[PDB]
mmCIF file of C-alpha atoms in Angstrom:
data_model
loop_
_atom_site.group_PDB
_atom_site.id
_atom_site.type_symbol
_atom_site.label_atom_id
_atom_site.label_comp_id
_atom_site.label_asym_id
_atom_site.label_seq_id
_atom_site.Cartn_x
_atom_site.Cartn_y
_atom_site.Cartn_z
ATOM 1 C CA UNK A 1 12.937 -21.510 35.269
ATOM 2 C CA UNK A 2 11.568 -19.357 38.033
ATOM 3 C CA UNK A 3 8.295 -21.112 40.001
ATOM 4 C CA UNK A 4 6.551 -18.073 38.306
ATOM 5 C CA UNK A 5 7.048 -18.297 34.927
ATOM 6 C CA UNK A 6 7.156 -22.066 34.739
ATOM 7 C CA UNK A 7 3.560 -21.570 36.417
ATOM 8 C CA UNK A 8 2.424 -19.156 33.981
ATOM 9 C CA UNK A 9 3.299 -21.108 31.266
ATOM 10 C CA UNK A 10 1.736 -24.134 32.331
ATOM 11 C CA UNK A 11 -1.228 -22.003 33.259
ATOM 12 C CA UNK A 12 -1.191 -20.282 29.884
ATOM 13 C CA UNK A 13 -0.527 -23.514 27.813
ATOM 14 C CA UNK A 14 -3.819 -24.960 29.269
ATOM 15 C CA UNK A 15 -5.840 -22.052 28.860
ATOM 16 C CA UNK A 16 -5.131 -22.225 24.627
ATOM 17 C CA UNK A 17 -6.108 -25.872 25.059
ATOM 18 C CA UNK A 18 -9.436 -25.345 26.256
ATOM 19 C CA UNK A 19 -10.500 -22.052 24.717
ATOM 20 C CA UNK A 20 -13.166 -21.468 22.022
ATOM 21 C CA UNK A 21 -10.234 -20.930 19.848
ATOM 22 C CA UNK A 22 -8.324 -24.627 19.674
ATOM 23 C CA UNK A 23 -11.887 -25.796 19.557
ATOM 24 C CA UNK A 24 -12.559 -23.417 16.550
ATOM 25 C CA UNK A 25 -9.299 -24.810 14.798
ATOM 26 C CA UNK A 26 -7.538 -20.731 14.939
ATOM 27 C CA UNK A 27 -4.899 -20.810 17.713
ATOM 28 C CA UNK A 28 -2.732 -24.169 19.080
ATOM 29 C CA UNK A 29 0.453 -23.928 20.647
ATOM 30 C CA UNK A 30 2.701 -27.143 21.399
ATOM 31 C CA UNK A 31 6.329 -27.935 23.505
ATOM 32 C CA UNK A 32 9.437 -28.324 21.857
ATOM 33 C CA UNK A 33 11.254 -28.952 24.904
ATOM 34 C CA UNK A 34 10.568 -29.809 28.266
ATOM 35 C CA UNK A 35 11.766 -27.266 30.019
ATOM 36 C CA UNK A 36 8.764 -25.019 28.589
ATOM 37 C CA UNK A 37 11.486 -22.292 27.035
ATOM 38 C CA UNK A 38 10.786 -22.606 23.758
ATOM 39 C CA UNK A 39 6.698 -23.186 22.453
ATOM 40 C CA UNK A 40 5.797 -23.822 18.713
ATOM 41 C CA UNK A 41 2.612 -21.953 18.359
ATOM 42 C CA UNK A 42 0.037 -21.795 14.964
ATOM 43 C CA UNK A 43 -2.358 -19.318 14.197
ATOM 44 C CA UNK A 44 -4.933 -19.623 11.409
ATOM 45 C CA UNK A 45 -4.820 -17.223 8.858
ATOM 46 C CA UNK A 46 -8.380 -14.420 9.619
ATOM 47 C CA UNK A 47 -11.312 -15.111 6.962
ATOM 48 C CA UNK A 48 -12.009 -12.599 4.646
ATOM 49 C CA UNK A 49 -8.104 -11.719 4.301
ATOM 50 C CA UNK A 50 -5.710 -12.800 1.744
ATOM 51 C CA UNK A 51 -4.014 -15.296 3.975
ATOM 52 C CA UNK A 52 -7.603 -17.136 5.115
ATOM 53 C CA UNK A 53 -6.967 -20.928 4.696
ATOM 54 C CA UNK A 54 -3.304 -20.347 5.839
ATOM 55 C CA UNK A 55 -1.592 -21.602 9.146
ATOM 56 C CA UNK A 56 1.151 -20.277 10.043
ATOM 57 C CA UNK A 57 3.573 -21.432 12.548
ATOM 58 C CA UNK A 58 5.472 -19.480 15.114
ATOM 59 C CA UNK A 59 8.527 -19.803 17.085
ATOM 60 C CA UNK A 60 7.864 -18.859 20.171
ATOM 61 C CA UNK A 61 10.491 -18.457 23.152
ATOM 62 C CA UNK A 62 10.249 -17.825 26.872
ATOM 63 C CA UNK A 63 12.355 -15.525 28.562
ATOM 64 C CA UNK A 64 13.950 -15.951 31.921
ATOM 65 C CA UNK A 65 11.615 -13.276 33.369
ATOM 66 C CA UNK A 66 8.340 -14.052 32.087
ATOM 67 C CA UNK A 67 6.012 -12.908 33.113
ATOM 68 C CA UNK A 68 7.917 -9.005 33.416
ATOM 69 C CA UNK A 69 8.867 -9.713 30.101
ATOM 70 C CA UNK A 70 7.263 -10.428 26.868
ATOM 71 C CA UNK A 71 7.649 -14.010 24.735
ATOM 72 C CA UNK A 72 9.929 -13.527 21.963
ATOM 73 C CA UNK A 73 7.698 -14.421 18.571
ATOM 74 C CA UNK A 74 9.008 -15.358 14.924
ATOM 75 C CA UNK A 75 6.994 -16.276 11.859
ATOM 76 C CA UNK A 76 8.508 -19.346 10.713
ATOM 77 C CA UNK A 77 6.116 -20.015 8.126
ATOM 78 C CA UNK A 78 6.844 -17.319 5.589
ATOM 79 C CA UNK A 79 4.253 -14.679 5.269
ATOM 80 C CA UNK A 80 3.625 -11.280 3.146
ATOM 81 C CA UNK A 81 3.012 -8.819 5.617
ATOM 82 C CA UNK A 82 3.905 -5.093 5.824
ATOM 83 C CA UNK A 83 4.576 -5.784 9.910
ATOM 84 C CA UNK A 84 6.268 -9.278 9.446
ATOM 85 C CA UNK A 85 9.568 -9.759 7.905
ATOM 86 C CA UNK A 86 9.325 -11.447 4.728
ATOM 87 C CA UNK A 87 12.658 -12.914 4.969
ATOM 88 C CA UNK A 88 12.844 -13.814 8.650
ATOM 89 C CA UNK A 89 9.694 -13.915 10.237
ATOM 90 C CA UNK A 90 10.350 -10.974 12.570
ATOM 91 C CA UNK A 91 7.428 -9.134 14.106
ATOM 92 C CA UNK A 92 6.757 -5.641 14.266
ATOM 93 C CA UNK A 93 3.739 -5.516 17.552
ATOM 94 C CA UNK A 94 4.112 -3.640 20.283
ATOM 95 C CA UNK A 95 2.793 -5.999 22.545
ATOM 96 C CA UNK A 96 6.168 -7.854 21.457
ATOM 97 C CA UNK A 97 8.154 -4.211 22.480
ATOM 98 C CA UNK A 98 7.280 -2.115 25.137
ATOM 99 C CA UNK A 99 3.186 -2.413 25.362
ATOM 100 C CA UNK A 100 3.712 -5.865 27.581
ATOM 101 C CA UNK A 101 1.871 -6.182 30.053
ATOM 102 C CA UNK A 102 1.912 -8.670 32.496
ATOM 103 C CA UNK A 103 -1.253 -10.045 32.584
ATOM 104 C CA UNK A 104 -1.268 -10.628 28.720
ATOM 105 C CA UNK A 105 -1.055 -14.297 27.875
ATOM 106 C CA UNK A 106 -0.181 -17.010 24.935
ATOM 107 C CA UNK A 107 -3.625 -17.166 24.007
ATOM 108 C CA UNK A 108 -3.956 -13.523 23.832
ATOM 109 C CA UNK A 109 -0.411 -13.053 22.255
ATOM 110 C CA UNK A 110 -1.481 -15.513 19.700
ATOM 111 C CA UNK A 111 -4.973 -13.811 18.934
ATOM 112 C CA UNK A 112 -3.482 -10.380 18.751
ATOM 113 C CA UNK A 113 -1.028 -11.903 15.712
ATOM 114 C CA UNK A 114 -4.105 -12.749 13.854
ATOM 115 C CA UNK A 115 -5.519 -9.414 15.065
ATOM 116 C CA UNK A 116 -2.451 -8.197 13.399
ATOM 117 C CA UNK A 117 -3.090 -10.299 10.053
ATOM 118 C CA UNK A 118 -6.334 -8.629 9.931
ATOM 119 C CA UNK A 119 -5.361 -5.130 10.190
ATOM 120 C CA UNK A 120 -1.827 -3.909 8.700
ATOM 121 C CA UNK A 121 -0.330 -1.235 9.995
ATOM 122 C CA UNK A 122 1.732 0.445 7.273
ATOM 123 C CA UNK A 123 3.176 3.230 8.896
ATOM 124 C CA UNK A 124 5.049 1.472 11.334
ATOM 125 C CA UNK A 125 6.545 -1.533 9.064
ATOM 126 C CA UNK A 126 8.668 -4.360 9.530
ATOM 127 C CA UNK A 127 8.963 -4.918 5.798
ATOM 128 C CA UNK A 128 9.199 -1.977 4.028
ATOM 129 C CA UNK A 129 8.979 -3.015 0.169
ATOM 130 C CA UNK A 130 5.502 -4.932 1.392
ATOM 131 C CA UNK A 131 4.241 -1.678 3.007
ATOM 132 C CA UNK A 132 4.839 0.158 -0.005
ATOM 133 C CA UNK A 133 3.167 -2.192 -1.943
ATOM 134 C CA UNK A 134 0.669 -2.569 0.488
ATOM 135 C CA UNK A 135 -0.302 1.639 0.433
ATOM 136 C CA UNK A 136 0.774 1.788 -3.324
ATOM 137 C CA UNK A 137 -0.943 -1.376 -5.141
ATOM 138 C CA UNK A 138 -3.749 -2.735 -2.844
ATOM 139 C CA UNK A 139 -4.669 -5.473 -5.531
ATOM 140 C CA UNK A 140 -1.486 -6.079 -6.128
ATOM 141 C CA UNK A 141 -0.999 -6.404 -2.323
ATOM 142 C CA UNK A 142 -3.963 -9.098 -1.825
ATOM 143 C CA UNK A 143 -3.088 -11.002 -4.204
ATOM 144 C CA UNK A 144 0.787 -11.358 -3.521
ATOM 145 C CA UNK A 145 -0.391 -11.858 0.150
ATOM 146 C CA UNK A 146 -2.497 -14.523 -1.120
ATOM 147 C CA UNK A 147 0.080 -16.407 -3.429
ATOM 148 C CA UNK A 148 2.221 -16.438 -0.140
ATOM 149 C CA UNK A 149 -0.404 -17.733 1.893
ATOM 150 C CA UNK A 150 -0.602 -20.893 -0.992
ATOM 151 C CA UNK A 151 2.841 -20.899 -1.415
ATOM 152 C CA UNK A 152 3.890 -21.365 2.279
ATOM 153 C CA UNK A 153 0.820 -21.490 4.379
ATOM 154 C CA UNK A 154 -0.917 -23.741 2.521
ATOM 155 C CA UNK A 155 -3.645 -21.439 1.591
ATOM 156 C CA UNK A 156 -5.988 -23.325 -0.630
ATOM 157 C CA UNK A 157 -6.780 -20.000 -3.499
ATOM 158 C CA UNK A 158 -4.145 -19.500 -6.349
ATOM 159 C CA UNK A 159 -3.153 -17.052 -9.013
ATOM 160 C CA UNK A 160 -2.531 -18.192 -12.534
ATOM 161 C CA UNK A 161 -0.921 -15.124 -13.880
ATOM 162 C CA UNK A 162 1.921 -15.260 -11.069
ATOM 163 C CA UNK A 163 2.465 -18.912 -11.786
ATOM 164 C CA UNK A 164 3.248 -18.882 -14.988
ATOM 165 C CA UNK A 165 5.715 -15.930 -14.695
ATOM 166 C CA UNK A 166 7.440 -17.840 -11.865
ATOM 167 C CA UNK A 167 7.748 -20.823 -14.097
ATOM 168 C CA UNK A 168 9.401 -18.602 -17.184
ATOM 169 C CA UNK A 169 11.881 -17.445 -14.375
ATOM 170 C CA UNK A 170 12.092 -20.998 -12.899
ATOM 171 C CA UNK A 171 12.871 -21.902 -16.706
ATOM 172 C CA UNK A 172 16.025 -20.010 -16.447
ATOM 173 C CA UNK A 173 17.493 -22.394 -13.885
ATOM 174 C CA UNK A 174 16.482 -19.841 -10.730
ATOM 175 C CA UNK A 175 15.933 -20.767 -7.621
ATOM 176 C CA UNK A 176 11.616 -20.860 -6.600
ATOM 177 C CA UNK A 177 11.357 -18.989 -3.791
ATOM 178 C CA UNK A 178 13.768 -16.297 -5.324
ATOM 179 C CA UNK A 179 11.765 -15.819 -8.190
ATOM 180 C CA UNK A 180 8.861 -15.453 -5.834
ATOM 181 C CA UNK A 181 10.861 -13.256 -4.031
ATOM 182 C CA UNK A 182 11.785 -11.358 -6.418
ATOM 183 C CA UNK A 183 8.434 -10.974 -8.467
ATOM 184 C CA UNK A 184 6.808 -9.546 -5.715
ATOM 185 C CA UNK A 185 9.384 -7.332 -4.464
ATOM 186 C CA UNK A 186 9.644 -5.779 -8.075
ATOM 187 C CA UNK A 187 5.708 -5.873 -8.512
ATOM 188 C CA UNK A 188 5.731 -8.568 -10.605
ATOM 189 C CA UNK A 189 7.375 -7.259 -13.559
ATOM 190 C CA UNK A 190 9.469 -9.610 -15.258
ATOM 191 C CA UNK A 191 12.609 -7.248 -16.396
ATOM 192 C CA UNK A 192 12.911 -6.053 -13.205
ATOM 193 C CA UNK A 193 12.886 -9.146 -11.200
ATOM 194 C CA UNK A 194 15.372 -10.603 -13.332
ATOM 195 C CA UNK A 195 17.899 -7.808 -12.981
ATOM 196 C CA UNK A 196 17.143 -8.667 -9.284
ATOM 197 C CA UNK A 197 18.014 -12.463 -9.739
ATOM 198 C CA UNK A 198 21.224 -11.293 -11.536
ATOM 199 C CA UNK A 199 22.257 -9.241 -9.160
ATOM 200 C CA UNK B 1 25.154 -28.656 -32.759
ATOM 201 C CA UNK B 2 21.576 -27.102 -32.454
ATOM 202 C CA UNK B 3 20.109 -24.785 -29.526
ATOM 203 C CA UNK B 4 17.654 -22.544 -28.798
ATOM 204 C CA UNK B 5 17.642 -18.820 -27.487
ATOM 205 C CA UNK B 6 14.724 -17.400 -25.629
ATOM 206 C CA UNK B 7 14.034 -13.781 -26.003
ATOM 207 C CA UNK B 8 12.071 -11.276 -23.615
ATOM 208 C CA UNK B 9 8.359 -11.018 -25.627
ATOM 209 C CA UNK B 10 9.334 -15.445 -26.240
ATOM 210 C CA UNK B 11 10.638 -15.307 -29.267
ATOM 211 C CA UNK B 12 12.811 -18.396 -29.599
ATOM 212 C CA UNK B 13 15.636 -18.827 -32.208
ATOM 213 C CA UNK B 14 17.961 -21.322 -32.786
ATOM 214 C CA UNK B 15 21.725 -21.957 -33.514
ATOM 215 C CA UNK B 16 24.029 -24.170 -34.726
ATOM 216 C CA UNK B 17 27.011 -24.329 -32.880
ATOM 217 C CA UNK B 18 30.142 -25.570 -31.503
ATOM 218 C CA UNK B 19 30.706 -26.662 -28.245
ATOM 219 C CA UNK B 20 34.133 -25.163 -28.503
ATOM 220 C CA UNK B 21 32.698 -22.218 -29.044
ATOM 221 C CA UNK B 22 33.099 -19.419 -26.866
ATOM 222 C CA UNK B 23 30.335 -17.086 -25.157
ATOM 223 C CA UNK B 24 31.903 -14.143 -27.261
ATOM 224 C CA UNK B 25 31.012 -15.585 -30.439
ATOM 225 C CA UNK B 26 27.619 -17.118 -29.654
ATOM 226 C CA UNK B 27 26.944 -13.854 -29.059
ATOM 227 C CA UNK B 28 28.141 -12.665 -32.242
ATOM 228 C CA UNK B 29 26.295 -15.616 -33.817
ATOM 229 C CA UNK B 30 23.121 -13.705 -31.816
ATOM 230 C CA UNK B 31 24.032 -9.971 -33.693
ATOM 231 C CA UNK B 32 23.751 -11.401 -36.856
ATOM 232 C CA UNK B 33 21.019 -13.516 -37.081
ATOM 233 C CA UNK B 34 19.588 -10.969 -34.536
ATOM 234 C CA UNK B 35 21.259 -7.618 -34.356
ATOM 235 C CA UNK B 36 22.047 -7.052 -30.821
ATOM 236 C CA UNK B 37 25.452 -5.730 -30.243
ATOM 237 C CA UNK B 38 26.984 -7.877 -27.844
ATOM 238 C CA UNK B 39 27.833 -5.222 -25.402
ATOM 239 C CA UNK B 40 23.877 -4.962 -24.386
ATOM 240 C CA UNK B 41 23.673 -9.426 -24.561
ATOM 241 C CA UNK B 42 23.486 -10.633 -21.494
ATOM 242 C CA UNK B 43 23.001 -15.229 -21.581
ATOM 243 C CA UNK B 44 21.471 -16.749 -19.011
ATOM 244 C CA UNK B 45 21.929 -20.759 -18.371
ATOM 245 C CA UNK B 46 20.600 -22.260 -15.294
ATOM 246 C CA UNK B 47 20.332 -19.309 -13.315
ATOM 247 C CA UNK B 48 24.142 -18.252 -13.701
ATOM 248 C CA UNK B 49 24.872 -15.381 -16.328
ATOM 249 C CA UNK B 50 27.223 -16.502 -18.842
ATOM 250 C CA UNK B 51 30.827 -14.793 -19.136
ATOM 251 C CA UNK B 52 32.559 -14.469 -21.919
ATOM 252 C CA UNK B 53 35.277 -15.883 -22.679
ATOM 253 C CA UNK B 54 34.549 -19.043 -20.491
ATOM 254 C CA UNK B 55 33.009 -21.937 -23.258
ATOM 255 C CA UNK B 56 29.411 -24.213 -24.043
ATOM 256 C CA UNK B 57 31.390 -27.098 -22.689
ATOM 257 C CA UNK B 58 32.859 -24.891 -19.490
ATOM 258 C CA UNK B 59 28.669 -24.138 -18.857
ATOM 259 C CA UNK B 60 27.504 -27.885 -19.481
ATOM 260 C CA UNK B 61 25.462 -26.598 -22.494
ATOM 261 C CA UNK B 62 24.522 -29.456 -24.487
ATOM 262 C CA UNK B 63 22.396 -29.862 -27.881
ATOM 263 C CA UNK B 64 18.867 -28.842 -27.676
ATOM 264 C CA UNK B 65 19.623 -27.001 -25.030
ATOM 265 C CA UNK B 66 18.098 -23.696 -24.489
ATOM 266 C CA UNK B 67 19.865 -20.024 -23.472
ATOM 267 C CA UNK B 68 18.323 -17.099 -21.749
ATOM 268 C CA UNK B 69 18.741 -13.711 -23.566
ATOM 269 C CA UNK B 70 18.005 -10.705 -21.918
ATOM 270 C CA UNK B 71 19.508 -7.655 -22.710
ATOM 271 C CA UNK B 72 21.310 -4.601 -20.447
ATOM 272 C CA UNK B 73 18.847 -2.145 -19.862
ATOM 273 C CA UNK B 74 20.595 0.952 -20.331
ATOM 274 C CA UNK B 75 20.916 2.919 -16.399
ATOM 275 C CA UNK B 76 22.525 5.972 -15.608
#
């Protein structure tokens, strides 16, 4: 890459390691490669939010004109969020779009995701059936969010009522993580997810 | 041969069967012993839904082994 961005990276990639936040377990971010092009970055899920306990890991790649241009981020650990995609990780942010700025970093990239777990913003989703859910069924929201977050994150708190309907669905020969899919798209009622699974 | 039907609120019921048998008429076993015209029967068997006309032994469905019923739910 250009002497610039390989020594912003570089630059960046040692300020995560020393700051308060490795230290305090929230934000890491690691090489894939050695050409520093493509990062694998992990972000703790906020306390006092359904996804606390979680890490979640993100795929994280440098374009050619970094700095003048802003890292490309993906959720690979699945996550229920109304600006994440459910299904692919994307990221709505506009940090991510056209609010880069140049002197924004990894570290602060990587705080402003949790910023983001923290503090939906609903009216300008990613994930549409989550942000519905989301302004619709708070409760219902939290605790999907949660069951996500112990699912796929790791998060340590779990729901017994959802379990047991994803077993009767799992009972049926379906898939896991389309009956989780599908009970919380269809707000966990049964008929309905199951016309989903059919279809 | 002997299997078992699970309903939507759990009921389960049981049959006795052929493997032979076609889907058609284990669903016509299912009106009688339950009522349910076939045309709203819908069998379920490791996550596939079961057409008729295919058979037990075309689906793998062995004794003891269990079905999922759930019905059409009308739409218009």
């Amino acid at each position: 890459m250009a002497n610039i961005a390989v020594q912003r990276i570089k630059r960046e990639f040692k300020e995560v390691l020393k700051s308060e936040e490795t230290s305090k377990n929230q934000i890491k971010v690691d090489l894939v490669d050695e050409n520093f092009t493509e990062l694998r970055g992990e972000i703790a899920g906020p306390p006092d939010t359904p996804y606390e306990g979680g890490r979640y890991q993100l795929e994280i790649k440098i374009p050619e004109t970094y700095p003048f241009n802003p890292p490309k981020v993906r959720f690979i650990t699945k996550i229920w969020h109304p600006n994440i995609s459910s299904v692919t990780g994307a990221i709505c942010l506009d940090i991510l779009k056209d609010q880069w700025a140049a002197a924004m970093t990894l570290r602060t990239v990587l705080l402003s995701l949790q910023a983001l777990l923290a503090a939906a913003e609903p009216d300008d989703p990613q994930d549409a059936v989550v942000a519905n859910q989301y302004k619709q069924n708070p409760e219902m929201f939290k605790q999907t969010a949660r069951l996500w977050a112990h699912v796929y994150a790791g998060a340590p708190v779990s729901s017994p009522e959802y379990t047991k309907k994803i077993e009767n669905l799992c009972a049926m020969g379906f898939d896991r993580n389309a009956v989780i899919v599908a009970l919380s798209s269809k707000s966990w009622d049964v008929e309905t997810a199951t016309e989903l699974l059919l279809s | 041969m002997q299997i078992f039907v699970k309903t939507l609120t759990g009921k389960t019921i049981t049959l006795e069967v052929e493997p032979s048998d076609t889907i058609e008429n284990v669903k016509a076993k299912i009106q009688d012993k339950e009522g349910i015209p076939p045309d709203q029967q819908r069998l379920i068997f490791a996550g596939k839904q079961l057409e008729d006309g295919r058979t037990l032994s075309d689906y793998n469905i062995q004794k003891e082994s269990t079905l999922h019923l759930v019905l059409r739910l009308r739409g218009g």
